[PDB]
Each structure stands twice: as C-alpha cells, then as structure tokens.
C-alpha cells in the first residue's frame, strides 16, 4: 500500500534490521565459528551462534545508509572567482572545465564505487564582496557550454547570446539559483575509474579524462563596468539524485593531488601520509 | 491571486533539503541503462564484508604488508598475551578497515561485530588460542584468567584455518558515538595462548595470523557526517 | 516546488484588507461568553432611536 509505504518514508523505517533471538547452550559437532577465509567468503556467523543471547526487538533502520542518502547531500565542487582588479573587460568573465574531482569531500564518496549513474542538482551561492564600498546592481550569467559549442573569448562575445545553450541569470538579492541535470553520459554509467587510454601509443592519455568530459561552465557579470570594483565568488554545490552505484571499492587512503588521476605523493615518513596512527606495540590499546 | 504567507526558512539553501528544480536540459533522453554486475544499494552491504585489520601497525611496520600480520611462536611462559585492541569501530587500528572507514561517515553506531582470524602456519603446526571480549566498566584484562571471565572463544587450529569471535552489542544506550567518547567506549579484545604453538622438527618456528572484521546482522550506522580519516590541505589541480 | 507568479499588491498593507494571520497566543482559551443585555449588531439599530435636535443652538 503506497500509503503504508509513505508512512515508512516519513518515519524512515523502510529498511529494518533483524531481531536478535534467544539462544541456548550447545554441544555439537557443527562448529559455525570455524570456517575458511581462503574461499573469499565472509563467515556469516551471528551473535546467537557464539553466546547465549536474549530476545531483543530491533528498531534500527538502514534507510540513512542507502546509496541515495550517502550521495544525496549537496557539497561544494567549485569556487569560481571574478575579481575586478584593473581591467573590467578581462576580469568580468571566466570559464571552468567541469568535473567532480577538485574537492576531496564529495570526490572521495563517489570514488567508493567504480560506476555510478545519477541525475544532478546544482545550487549556486554567489557572494559579492564590496572591495571599494558599494556593489551596485549585480546580475550574473552562468552559461553551460557543451563540448563543441563556441567558448566566449570576451565579455561581449556573441556566444553569450545563448541561442541554444542553457544559461541561468541571477540578480543579486534574489534567492540562490538551482536547476537539475539528467544523467549526461554517452555510456550507461559514469566511470569513477577507467583503466584505459584514448589510443595505443606512448603519448595516449590514461584515466577518466578520456571518458569524463562534461564541457565548460562560462560565467560573466552581466552588468557593465561600475565605479566600485567587486569580487564575486560563486560556489557551486552538487547533489546526486536518483542514484545507482556498482562495484564498491576501498576508500582513498592518501590525499588527492590531481584531477582525473589516482596519483599521489609519499613523504619519507609514510605513516604521516595515511590516517593510521602508529601503535606502541601489539598489546597497547 | 491566492493569498500566501511566506514562512521562515524561505529562500535559504540547506545542503540536505529535498526539493524539486527545473531541468536545464528539457526533452533530453538519458542513455539506455544496461545491466552491470555488482550493484550496491545500501552501505550495509559493504559493512558485511571482511577486510583486514592493520593490527600490527607499529611505526616500523606501517607501509609494509607486515602491519597486517601477528606473529606466533613457541612460548616458554604459559598464557602469554598476543595482542590487545579496543573494540570501538572507529578507533585505531580498526579505523582504516572498510567498516571503520564507513562508520567514520556516520556519528552513531550499534550492533555486533564479527572478528575473524586465519592461521598461516604450516599444515603441521598446531595451536590453541583464547580470544576474549571485555565489556566496558573495567580496564583491559591483565591476565588470561582475567580475560577468560568475559565473552570468549577458544580457537583450536586444525583443518579449518579460520575462526570467528562475535563481540555482542552490550551497551547501556541503544547507540554509541563512532568518535572516541568515554561514555560510549565499547571495551577490549585480547588474545592469549591457551596451550602453545607446537611444531615437529624441521618446521619454521614462527607463523603469521591475519585478522578480519565485519558487521553482524544487527550492525547499523546513523547520522551522516563528514569523515575525519581524510583531508585536503591544498587545491586539487589538473 | 509549485511555480507561482507574485501579483502586484503583494506585501502591501491596506487598512481595509481581510486576510488571516497566525495567532500570537497559541492554545489560549478565551473567557466564557456570558449573556449581557443590549447587544447591538448593526448601527441601523442606533439610527432608529429618537434623539434631541439642538435646534435652538444660537451662540448664547
């Protein structure tokens, strides 16, 4: 019943954990505690098998541990800066080659999977710093330039006409812009990792750069030059919606160094590069 | 028009809100979904898989596979201690195991833990070991007799290489903090020689042991938070 | 969310408007009403009663 299901949604009780049943003393030639990890399987022994348990009714739910929940939180993926210093025409617009690899927090979470398919929700948080005192009337334009479309080279480039590309205009004072984006890949899922090249020569590129081109985000202050200089910083937040993930993998153990690559750097004292805290010895808790 | 009353909260952006928004690409039709083996629907699926505990992570072993093994050998004193660690899911050395890493993305945890051990000695090497779990409210046991009074398993090494010890959920509160908190510390796991490591002549006099951990059917995490087991101290560039 | 179009007039305060507003005292229960003679429901009730005309209202 969709209504019962609805109640479960509201209470977050869609996925319930099993109860613990009462167990008793045993004397058997069936030893559940003994097994063989060589098989590559985890011994499914439960508490009732190794001790005498009481009956307990579980009320815990796994809803929050769902992939939708894990990746369904909006996090920052880019900080765009437009700092008017001495040349408005050159400093009033910029561009970014879109990717979800520049911020460690969300990158690490997505990378716990090999392939992921999801729709995106983008929320932008623009903040205008009044460097000289007033901010005037700031109107921003964020244009999505898919790979192939002409990238504007000046603040008045014809490409800004956005005759076909999707543009979002924001007026200072109005609520934060937000829009959704359908799964964009040309494949069935996004590659979080890609053990391949775009060719078979010594100079072929390796990794997700080959498969994950999302195009360019071009921004510009629509307002013409003003007396007082401003510094507009637009923070882009991304959230995954309607998510699916395949083949889980180990979490990133060392810091990230670059986008589209698993490369890392190690110091002379590697224990400083990982989160493992050295133990005094085996018996010191 | 319909009279409305704008409520507080309007226009704000909460990173955990759940609203709808217009699609920037109208009419766009997503690529057909194909079957791919290995779909994961809930993180619990990853918490139920055994991963190795870097139990021997002394400063000299870190960066070596040896940080994952415990060495056993013939003893001259009886009931000697082999190893001791805290049961707290996000404490060290449990922290970097898959279950520890996932638990660090949450604030609360509950449930029973499954610790498995695989003996790597020769087929002719025998040994009986006592694995014990000491519930909180007391310090770690100082002797086998002290440990033996708590929850424990006597492991006899034979044809089947692996044994499992379950640390039952024994707590006052239904949940505990994943982060080290005095009130919610869960106790200890100690390992002792029950008998002794015995081998025939011409057989290596030491052997290794591997340690695994995963969650039982009642394991559950709650209240998502950012992890403290990974950081970004600078920009990630192209 | 439901797409809306804010119409002119929004946010204004007209002294003769007739809207609803949240109650500052939730759960409060007003004092019981008792019968009081003389209830007036319409001003016409007062216009139908004779009153004296100050017809000889010379300054003196």
């Amino acid at each position: 019943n969709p209504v019962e299901r609805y109640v479960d949604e509201v209470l977050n009780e869609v996925l319930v954990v099993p109860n613990i049943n009462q167990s008793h003393p045993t004397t058997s030639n069936a030893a559940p505690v003994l097994d063989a990890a060589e098989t590559g399987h985890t011994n499914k022994i439960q508490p009732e098998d190794t001790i005498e348990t009481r009956y307990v009714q579980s009320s815990q739910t796994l809803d929050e541990m769902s992939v939708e929940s894990f990746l369904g939180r909006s996090g920052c993926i880019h900080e765009s800066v437009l700092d008017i210093v001495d040349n408005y025409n050159d400093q009033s617009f910029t561009k970014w080659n879109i990717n979800l690899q520049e911020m460690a927090q969300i990158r690490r979470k997505f990378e716990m999977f090999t392939y992921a398919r999801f729709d995106s929700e983008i929320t932008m948080v623009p903040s205008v710093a009044a460097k000289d005192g007033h901010i005037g009337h700031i109107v921003m334009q964020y244009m999505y330039v898919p790979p192939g479309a002409p990238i504007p080279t000046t603040r008045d480039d014809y490409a800004w006409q956005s005759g076909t590309n999707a543009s979002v205009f924001w007026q200072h004072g109005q609520p934060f812009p937000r829009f959704s984006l359908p799964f964009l890949s040309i494949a069935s899922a996004y590659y979080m990792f890609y053990d391949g090249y775009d060719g078979d020569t010594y100079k072929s590129r390796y990794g997700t750069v080959v498969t994950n081109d999302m195009g360019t985000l071009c921004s510009r202050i629509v307002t013409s030059e003003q007396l007082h200089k401003v510094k507009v910083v637009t923070r882009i937040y991304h959230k995954a919606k309607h998510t699916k993930a395949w083949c889980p993998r180990p979490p990133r153990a060392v810091q990230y160094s670059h986008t589209h690559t698993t490369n890392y750097k190690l110091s002379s004292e590697v224990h400083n590069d990982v989160a493992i805290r050295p133990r005094t010895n085996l018996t010191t808790v | 028009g319909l009279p409305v009353y704008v409520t507080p909260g309007s226009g704000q952006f909460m990173t955990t809100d759940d609203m709808q928004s217009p699609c920037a690409l109208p009419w766009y039709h997503p690529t057909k979904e194909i079957f791919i083996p290995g779909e994961v629907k809930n993180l619990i699926e990853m918490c139920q898989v055994d991963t190795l505990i870097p139990i021997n992570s002394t400063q000299s072993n870190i960066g070596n596979v040896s940080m994952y093994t415990v060495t056993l050998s013939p003893q001259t004193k009886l009931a000697e201690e082999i190893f001791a660690i805290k049961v707290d899911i996000a404490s060290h050395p449990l922290a970097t195991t898959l279950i520890g890493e996932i638990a660090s993305y949450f604030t609360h945890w509950t449930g029973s833990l499954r610790f498995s051990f695989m003996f790597c000695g020769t087929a002719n090497t025998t040994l009986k070991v006592l694995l014990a779990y000491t519930p909180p409210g007391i310090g770690k046991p100082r002797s086998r007799k002290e440990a033996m009074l708590g929850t424990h398993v006597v492991w006899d090494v034979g044809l089947q290489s692996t044994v499992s010890l379950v640390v039952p959920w024994i707590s006052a509160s239904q949940y505990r903090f994943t982060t080290p908190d005095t009130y919610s510390s869960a106790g200890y796991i100690t390992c002792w020689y029950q008998t002794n490591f015995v081998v025939p002549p011409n057989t290596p006099n030491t052997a290794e042991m591997l340690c695994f951990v995963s969650g039982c059917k009642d394991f559950c995490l709650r209240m998502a938070r950012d992890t403290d087991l990974h950081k970004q101290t600078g920009p990630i560039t192209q | 969310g439901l797409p809306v179009y804010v119409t002119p007039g929004s946010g204004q305060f007209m002294t003769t408007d007739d809207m609803q507003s949240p109650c500052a005292l939730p759960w409060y229960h007003p004092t019981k009403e008792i019968f009081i003679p003389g209830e007036v429901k319409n001003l016409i009730e007062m216009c139908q009663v004779d009153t004296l005309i100050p017809i000889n209202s010379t300054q003196s």
């Binding site: 209504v3 609805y6 | 928004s21 217009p22 | -």
Partner: peptide, 29 residues
C-alpha cells in the same frame, strides 16, 4: 504530476516539472 493515494490519509506525490531529473530524492529499495 500527481500520485493520489487514499487510506482518510491521502498522499499527493506531485511532480511539478515535466522532466524526471527534476523530482526529489528517490524512494528506497
């Protein structure tokens, strides 16, 4: 876009925009 259920406890799962990407978080399982 309205999925009207009845039980009375009536559910109104409205989809305000015409693209599936526009809807909120997915249901579970």
């Amino acid at each position: 876009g309205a999925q009207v259920s009845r039980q009375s406890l009536n559910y109104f799962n409205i989809n305000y925009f015409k693209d599936a990407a526009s809807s909120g978080a997915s249901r579970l399982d």
